[PDB]
Amino acid sequence: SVRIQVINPNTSLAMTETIGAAARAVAAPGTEILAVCPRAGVPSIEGHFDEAIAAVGVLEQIRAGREQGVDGHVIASFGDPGLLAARELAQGPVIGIAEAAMHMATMVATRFSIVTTLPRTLIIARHLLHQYGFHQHCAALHAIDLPVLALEDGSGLAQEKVRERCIRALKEDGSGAIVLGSGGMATLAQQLTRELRVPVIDGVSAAVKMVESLVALGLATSKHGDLAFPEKKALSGQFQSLNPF
Amino acid sequence: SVRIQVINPNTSLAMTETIGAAARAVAAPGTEILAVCPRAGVPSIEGHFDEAIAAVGVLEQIRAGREQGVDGHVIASFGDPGLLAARELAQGPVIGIAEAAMHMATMVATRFSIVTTLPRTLIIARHLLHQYGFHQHCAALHAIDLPVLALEDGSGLAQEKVRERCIRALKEDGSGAIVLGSGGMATLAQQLTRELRVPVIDGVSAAVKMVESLVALGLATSKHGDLAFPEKKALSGQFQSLNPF
Amino acid sequence: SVRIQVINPNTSLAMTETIGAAARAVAAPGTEILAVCPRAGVPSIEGHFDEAIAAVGVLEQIRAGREQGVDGHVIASFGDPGLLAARELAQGPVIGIAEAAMHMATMVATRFSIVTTLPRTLIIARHLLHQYGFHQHCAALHAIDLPVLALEDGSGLAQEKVRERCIRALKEDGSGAIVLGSGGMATLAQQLTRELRVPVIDGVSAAVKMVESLVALGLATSKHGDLAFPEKKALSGQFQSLNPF
Amino acid sequence: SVRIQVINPNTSLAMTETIGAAARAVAAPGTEILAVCPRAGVPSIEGHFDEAIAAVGVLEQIRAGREQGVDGHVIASFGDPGLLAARELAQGPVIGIAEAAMHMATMVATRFSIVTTLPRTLIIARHLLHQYGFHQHCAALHAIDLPVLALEDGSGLAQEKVRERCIRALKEDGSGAIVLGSGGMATLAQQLTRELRVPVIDGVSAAVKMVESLVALGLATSKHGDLAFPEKKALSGQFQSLNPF
Amino acid sequence: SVRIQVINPNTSLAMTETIGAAARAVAAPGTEILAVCPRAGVPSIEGHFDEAIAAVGVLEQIRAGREQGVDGHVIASFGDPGLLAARELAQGPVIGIAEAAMHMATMVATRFSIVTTLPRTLIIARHLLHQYGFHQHCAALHAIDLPVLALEDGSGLAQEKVRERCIRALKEDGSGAIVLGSGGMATLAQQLTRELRVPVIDGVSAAVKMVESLVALGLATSKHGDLAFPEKKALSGQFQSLNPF
Amino acid sequence: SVRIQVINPNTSLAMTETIGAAARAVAAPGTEILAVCPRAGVPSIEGHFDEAIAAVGVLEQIRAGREQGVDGHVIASFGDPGLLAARELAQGPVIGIAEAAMHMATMVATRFSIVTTLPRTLIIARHLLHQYGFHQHCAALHAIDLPVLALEDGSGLAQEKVRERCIRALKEDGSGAIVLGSGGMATLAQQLTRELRVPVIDGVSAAVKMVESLVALGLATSKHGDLAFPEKKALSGQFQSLNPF
Ligand SMILES: NC(=O)NC1=NC(=O)NC1=O
């Protein structure tokens, strides 16, 4: 059996449930999803300050996952907070949802467009594009100008704004696919794909498949050099529980 | 059930058997592998001239796969010949082995090294690095200075040269993983991974998992814009059978 | 005397005549133009599938040119299909028309705009910009949204649409020159240059001058390393005639 | 008067004293240095896991600095952990020591070389080079293969290894200046500059001057868009004290 | 005491006075500003021809500054003409105003917009962005379509056009700061910063602070390799006075 | 008839004669070469200071050429000093020898190596590679560590050092062609091409062919936007004769 810990980096249990449901919907036979969120942190991630807090919350759950002996990890917010930090701490592979969505997009289209939540998160997505090397593959980046948690507020306004922005993107951007720029849009991907007749990609589902793929290939994070286990040292105060290994 | 057509772009049946075996070894339950090679073409791909011939052979098999109604396709040589051409013709996703190996490498290491066959193929690998956007993620490229088919000649010389070059790469390059730069090295990946304690990645096995992943996600090649079906026109002579749809 | 084989990669004899006329119009004293097209292939090139077919047709004519002992070769479609493959097979220099037009544009302007045929060919032009290294030198890319062969249909609609798009480009793009993105626009270049008072560049005429230049300099394709003659191997079926040397 | 909070992101008081001394040595008349370190965290930063912990410790001190009404902030470790997060939280400018050292290097030399502590920190420095846009300005990156705190162990071994590596860099790399890749090397910069007759740059001292410069120019972090104050939300557990504003 | 030679590369005494006033307004206690312009040259710099003339005028003043034994130099036009040439000739640091403004902008914002004078100077600013490595940090470049000296013509039209363009930039570009693209806009920076509540940066004032910073750090131009004193040779005619050292 | 002004940017008449001879050796029937050098300037160009002086000397000769009504211009030193300035002033096309050599190299090889004079000129060549967009096409840059005028000193030492460095480059660099990095190496190109059996390219001869090509194509520098004639203004002192038009 394969056990994958899907970590929502924010403390919203509502978003954790949406992310968890999306992960189970595409999970292969024999795969168990462990949908979790940090005990302490931020309800939504909307900037660099929120990401720095989320990164430590991710590491808290990574530690818990490694203690449980899970096969892999997913970081389920579009900023992929603490990705490389998590890879150092974890033995199994760690996949970010932005990373996974962008990787899948290059396999089904020449260029993709990103539709995300707030304007101030666009720069974070731009940095990830350069970091992962997909900047040339991204035709345009768009924000719906609503807070992250608007996707969970029951109104359906954010979902409709994503839909409308996806249609506009396919007409103007010169792209063949859409990358959804939030973990909250996870369930909207399958509906828009069928409706718009183009790949509309959710990173949550994509990252699950990447972990499953790597485990089946017998591949895990390289412990040689850059992503080796953290150097042995004493952590103080609030951080002392992060590395008991 | 999932049916994946794994196309060896060269006409070597020996290499087709090695590629086919590697694909079946990692295939998920319910996945059938259709290992094929072109009826006409080149025995091995060792340059730009060979690639141009291989690309048309790929398209010949893509057509056959689409007629059979396969779920996806794999292009099983490290130059990914005719990748975008194949995506236009095929309905299901088409994944190159260089593409897949490089994508997996960025998920398990910060930087990777490439170990391939001939010096003259290095430029092709360099172009693909820039095209896919992984140039910054590649620490170094290496060639063992033996012809592609030396991996099939039974001597074990090419296999030992790959091993020795992998050890040297991990010591000098400042990389955490190895990408094997040939479809003939497909079976060597699992042995070197266990022996060297680092991810040594085969593109053949990786591409199979990518096709399986995309099919499970309900994602296929975008037929909107760049990778749309080829424009309706009459093909003459040797090419007339390529697009009966 | 200098003999230059100008290869139209598509099978349209009408386009071959337009390309041939443009080549002879700028040819230096003592230069003979051999305007040719493949015996088998595609009537027009409008995507990646068409390019893969065209590349082999180019190689067929390259072989014929080398047997005849021509001094150089021109690949006369804006995707420069099979350029590096042709350079391996040929002894004399091989120049693509996109390559040549872009090279000339950087010599007469700081930045240039591209005006081509179909929207789906734009990505091909974008890839060539990155491959040749002129991406920063290209201010914008534009398509007239008509099929390639509309330039040969006698209506004059495509020609007028190119004209109108050239005027708009010079006003909006912040560029000093125009690169015509088709072999069919070859004869329109001189008229628009005089009319718009800016360099409007045809790749066909430019590539002829590049071949003439290289021959006069006593320079041909390097047979050391990457562009060396293809490795000796047996080609099967439809490809057996490609390398009799 | 100008008050600058210099934050050592690690919990080593020994390194905090070295950093504090370097800051006061170059401080302009009327400038008070507030040398601090986090109450909880990691003794030294040697990888991505350490950086994620350090980033939150930085934010803890940023909050304290803003409450005190300081004019600016310095992040005094070569990974510039939590730089953009700190800029969101703080009103005054926040300057990283890697950022500052690299900025100064481009003003006194065409290209610079980096001499840092551990091999595994090189990738972090490489990422910062790309992020800040100085990758082309960096000729080479070097590590002395000793832990960060070796600079504080009293042996003088790390200091001598830095010296020897600086001499080798100036001979081999083709660079005109050296950037010291640690906050612990802060006091070594002035000695090597005089001895080697080239700019050997400490980021700590450089960042102090940048804060002083920006304050004198009447410039602070832009609160429009990306680096605006964090969105109002409730932080839980260990993070609740980070944003009382 | 610190003496900084601020060189206006154009021969406009009116612009020299504006530049000189801006330099003195931010100068630290003990700093003397030597505001100068060339004896021969061009009244305003509006293209590549003007820049080549200005570069030699800069060198003329650099020589004068070095003879006087000044601590540093500022090149006070947005094209930074003869920057590297000046660094070779001078002993003290030489800072360009475009260089300094761009460097400061990356410290207070994620991305910046440029507002300059003429459309034809935009390409010069684009080249400097690539040369200094801040191309990714620049969201947009804008020109007010008025000659450089319009800022000195007393009408206030150019100043109002800069203001209006700054407001439009902050609304459309997705940037957090403005870089003023002329030495004539030097005094407008402080007013727009207070009015628009964002960093509006003048390169003249910024470059002064950079020179002061480098002098306090005990850092000057590297005379090892690329920016070494010019090779000893005899200059003829109009240039004979440029290198008496 | 076609008249091409070949400008040696340095004041060495010996180098002017070598450059002039190389230009006439490849000149087409009907082409007259006007080999010139500035009346005032520097005997050799070995750094940024020398280039700034050379640029104005180029403009002096450009003015003379335009008054004479020449068809085009060549800037015959490997730094292409004042290239864009010259294009503004001149009506006919202006081609740099570094520009031309690099352009030809991409047409005959995948990657090229540069062999130049002094180590301190390498950075200038590196900047031109980035500016022209051929950085990825350049495998390596090499300097023979002799002054520029050593090629004219009659010893044959510099010529032998170029030869030896060319052989080493072809063995180590992984390149297919050599670009000679000086106007003094102009006559060595044909001998090394025949001897080493690879393209060894002289920029002087290449630039002549580019001017001839552009004239035959009826193409000249764009006077729309960036390379328009310099704005009408009064030049003072030593520069007053530069723009009488
Ligand atoms: N919406 C985003 O851009 N990032 C996110 N913030 C979250 O809290 N979850 C996300 O995916």
Ligand SMILES: NC(=O)NC1=NC(=O)NC1=O
């Ligand atoms: N070895 C390679 O670099 N490319 C290849 N040529 C082949 O025939 N198969 C390959 O994978």
Ligand SMILES: NC(=O)NC1=NC(=O)NC1=O
């Ligand atoms: N128009 C293009 O973009 N490419 C072309 N297709 C052709 O058939 N000829 C071309 O030049």
Ligand SMILES: NC(=O)NC1=NC(=O)NC1=O
């Ligand atoms: N030495 C480094 O590369 N980074 C650092 N780790 C620390 O603890 N301080 C540093 O400057």
Ligand SMILES: NC(=O)NC1=NC(=O)NC1=O
């Ligand atoms: N306005 C500019 O873009 N450049 C300049 N020309 C000048 O004369 N001074 C400048 O700053």
Ligand SMILES: NC(=O)NC1=NC(=O)NC1=O
């Ligand atoms: N050798 C060079 O790199 N540049 C040059 N200096 C000159 O004087 N002529 C050149 O070509």
